[PDB]
Amino acid sequence: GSTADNKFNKEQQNAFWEILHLPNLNEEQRNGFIQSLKDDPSQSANLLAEAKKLNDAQAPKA
Known part of the structure; x- marks a missing residue:
């Protein structure tokens, strides 16, 4: 069909939203996470975790 068809099931797909959402992370950082994540399922x-912890520390509020 193509290659990996980004089989981001309900469990894996969660990464995308949580990535795109990352309320407190540079959305430009979010996007970067999508590109690296998409091309590599x-x-x-590695992306979901990196974005998770990064957003936490880099998060403005406190």
Whole structure:
């Protein structure tokens, strides 16, 4: 069909939204996470996690 068809199931897809949303993370950082994540579905863990912790610390509010 193509290659990996980004099989971001309900569990993996969550990464995308949480990535795109990242309320407190540079949305430009969010986008970057999408590109790296999309091109590499096996990286969903490395991107989702990196974006999760980063957003937490880099988050403005406190």
